[PDB]
Amino acid sequence: WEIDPKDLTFLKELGTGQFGVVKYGKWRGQYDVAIKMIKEGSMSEDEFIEEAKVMMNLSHEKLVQLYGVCTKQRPIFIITEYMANGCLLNYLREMRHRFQTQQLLEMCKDVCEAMEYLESKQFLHRDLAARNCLVNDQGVVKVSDFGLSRYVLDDEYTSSVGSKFPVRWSPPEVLMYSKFSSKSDIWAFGVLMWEIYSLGKMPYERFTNSETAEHIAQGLRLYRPHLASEKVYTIMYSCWHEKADERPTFKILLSNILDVMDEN
Numbered sequence: 001w002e003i004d005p006k007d008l009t010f011l012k013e014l015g016t017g018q019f020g021v022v023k024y025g026k027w028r029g030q031y032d033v034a035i036k037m038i039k040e041g042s043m044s045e046d047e048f049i050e051e052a053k054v055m056m057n058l059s060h061e062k063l064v065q066l067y068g069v070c071t072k073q074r075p076i077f078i079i080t081e082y083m084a085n086g087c088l089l090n091y092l093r094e095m096r097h098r099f100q101t102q103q104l105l106e107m108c109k110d111v112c113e114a115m116e117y118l119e120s121k122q123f124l125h126r127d128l129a130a131r132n133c134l135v136n137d138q139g140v141v142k143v144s145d146f147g148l149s150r151y152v153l154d155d156e157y158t159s160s161v162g163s164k165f166p167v168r169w170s171p172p173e174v175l176m177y178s179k180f181s182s183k184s185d186i187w188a189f190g191v192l193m194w195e196i197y198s199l200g201k202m203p204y205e206r207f208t209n210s211e212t213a214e215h216i217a218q219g220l221r222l223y224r225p226h227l228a229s230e231k232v233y234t235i236m237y238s239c240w241h242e243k244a245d246e247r248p249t250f251k252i253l254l255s256n257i258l259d260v261m262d263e264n
């Protein structure tokens with residue numbers, strides 16, 4: 001849906017992402033929004049515009065909503081829901097001494113609900129990770145920038161040997177064959193759970209990307225974080241089966257997480 005740029009008020013800089021500058025503003029003077037200004041050359045724009053209706057129609061409380069676009073000028077804009085506490089990865093690190101384990105499990109539930117919804121729509125995120133989750137003013141985690149990796153023009157990001165490719169969140173079949181599926185999102189979700197329970201540590205820290213690929217291909221897996229119970233670790237570990245068809249669905253993962261909450 002085409003937003004009238006006259007309805008947007010820019011208020012604050014939010015930094016730079018894969019597609020360039022992002023700003024905080026308001027729509028019609030009332031609703032907080034983030035406005036991506038798509039840097040020319042950074043996105044396959046014709047392809048995104050051609051395919052963007054499905055993305056806007058994804059509607060779930062735990063997705064950072066894509067409200068609309070402005071495409072009748074350059075640079076084009078993507079207008080999304082605004083999340084006052086920013087990126088989950090920074091949020092985990094800034095509050096790491098305060099979180100209770102129940103809050104960490106709730107963050108996992110938030111993301112799993114969003115991914116179950118995307119799964120039910122046969123829609124792949126493709127770059128699920130704590131850096132691509134956001135946190136609102138009440139501590140609710142939502143999944144951000146689902147699907148946009150498909151439109152990135154940046155060889156360092158699109159090549160599996162590039163420095164920006166999400167190697168540490170990728171299953172073997174992505175690293176070897178670029179086989180993206182629901183089950184590669186499952187693998188990434190497990191790594192995300194690990195990020196949450198490690199309070200924002202880098203997966204496979206001190207390994208390079210290629211060393212990470214080599215060693216997960218040989219069965220190396222992330223260790224259990226101190227704050228993860230055995231039941232919680234069993235959930236994240238189930239996401240890392242070498243064979244994609246042995247990995248659970250997000251429906252099953254959500255059931256597992258709710259069972260742990262009930263027991264607690």
Ligand SMILES: Cn1cc(-c2ccnc(-n3ncc4cc(C(C)(C)C)cc(F)c4c3=O)c2CO)cc(NC(=O)[C@@H]2C[C@@H]2F)c1=O
Nearest residue numbers: 014015016017018022034082083084085086127145148149
């Ligand atoms: C909705 N939103 C977005 C951002 C924000 C700002 C700058 N770059 C980004 N970015 N990052 C990463 C990113 C990644 C990708 C792929 C394709 C997956 C690689 C595509 C993107 F397009 C982006 C992007 O655009 C965002 C994420 O969309 C920040 C918010 N909030 C705050 O900063 C609060 C002040 C507190 F910290 C916010 O609410």
